[PDB]
């Protein structure tokens, strides 16, 4: 849809000086001299653009081209031959003059062009911790609930009075169950309505997720999804921002509380009454509370106690439990409980059970019930 190639019109016979805007679309110029009489040839210089006014001819109004333009860019070019622009031409103010020969070269005509500067690309995402500190040159590990920045860097500068593009942002998280990278995010960064080059995160990550990886991917077009690998590339695009979230103060991740429910519902951050006796032919729900945890995988076994101190394990559950946003409730079948139980008495009133969570993780430590913490399996 966008002109690539200009054929740009030069009457020798006029006084006044043509002046052209060039897209960075365009990557060729044809220059086409009025007078075909006699031969002409071209030479141009450039001087760099410094606001955004330029790339209008009224900006170049009040202007000396002759002092500015100085840095050559080509010398003695027949007219009949392209002006081909490439990345080192954009954003520059070109004087074109064209000469034919009398004698001696002999100044006739005269263009300007207003190269406008090129198309705005994402080459790097800089972490920037609470205080605005520059934190490293990649990816990060960060605590949960702390504010932070993702500050976005160009492939130039942007002119003076030149506006921030349109700076799109897709925040990924990884799933708790398949560890694979969801979308949960899909925002301009934008502060105060306008448009802006970082990215703010005021209230930080939430807690519930540490454990989790997040990505931010960047774009002034559609940002990259997952795998987040330039084309035909096994390297990181450097439009993304990786995070590994921890939780905030805490030293390591860790079990808090592995609990007989009342209820099957379990939230983070929230307790709910302990159920203190439960039948054989009933469920228990054993709730798992953790931190920094999320998406860990951790294996239940149900111990019983004795009045003489002695634990023995009953049963180890079958498929390996996992950790969602530092919770999960398990339901466990007293049936085989009860029945392993049993089996190795041959007398009490209940069984006292009590649970074992141990993380796959072995560098998490597990956890165990104590005796304000088990349940009452009844007997007859």
């Not at 802006?196 to 519930?208: I, V, W």
């Not at 905030?248 to 939230?267: A, F």
Request: one cysteine or more; charged letters at 25%; proline letters at 4%.
């Amino acid at each position: 849809h966008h002109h690539h190639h200009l054929t740009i019109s030069i009457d020798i016979k006029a006084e006044d000086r043509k002046y052209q805007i060039v897209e960075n679309s365009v990557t060729s110029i044809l220059f086409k001299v009025s007078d075909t009489t006699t031969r002409y040839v071209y030479n141009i210089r450039m001087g760099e653009m410094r606001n955004e006014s330029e790339t209008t001819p009224e900006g170049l109004k009040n202007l000396n081209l002759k002092k500015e333009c100085d840095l050559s860019v080509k010398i003695r070019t027949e007219a009949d031959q392209a002006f081909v622009l490439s990345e080192k031409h954009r954003g520059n103010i070109m004087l074109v003059e064209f000469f034919k020969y009398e004698g001696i070269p002999v100044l006739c005509a005269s263009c300007v062009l207003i190269v406008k500067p090129s198309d705005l690309k994402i080459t790097q995402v800089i972490f920037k911790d609470s205080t605005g500190k520059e934190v490293g040159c990649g990816s990060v590990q960060y605590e949960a609930n702390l504010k932070f920045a993702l500050r976005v860097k160009y492939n130039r500068p942007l002119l003076r009075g030149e506006k921030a593009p349109k700076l799109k942002c897709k925040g990924y998280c990884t799933n708790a169950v398949t560890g694979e990278y969801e979308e949960i995010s899909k925002f301009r960064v934008d502060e105060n309505g306008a448009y802006t080059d970082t990215f703010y995160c005021d209230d930080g990550l939430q807690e519930s997720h540490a454990g989790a990886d997040y990505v931010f991917s960047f774009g002034i077009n559609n940002p990259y999804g997952p795998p987040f690998m330039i084309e035909d590339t096994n390297v990181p695009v450097p439009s993304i921002q990786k995070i590994h979230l921890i939780g905030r103060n805490l030293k390591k991740p860790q079990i808090t509380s592995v609990i007989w429910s009342s209820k099957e519902m379990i939230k983070f951050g929230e307790d709910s009454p302990r159920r203190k006796s439960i039948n054989y032919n009933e469920d228990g729900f054993l709730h798992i509370h953790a931190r920094g945890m999320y998406g860990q995988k951790v294996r239940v076994e149900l111990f019983e106690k004795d009045s003489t101190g002695i634990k023995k394990l009953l049963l180890g559950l079958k498929d390996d439990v996992t950790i969602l946003d530092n919770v999960v409730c398990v339901p466990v079948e007293m049936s085989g409980v009860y029945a392993k139980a049993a089996k190795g008495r041959h007398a009490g009133l209940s069984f006292e059970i009590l649970a074992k969570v141990t993380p796959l993780d072995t560098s998490i430590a597990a956890f165990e019930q104590d005796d304000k913490s088990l349940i009452e399996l009844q007997i007859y």
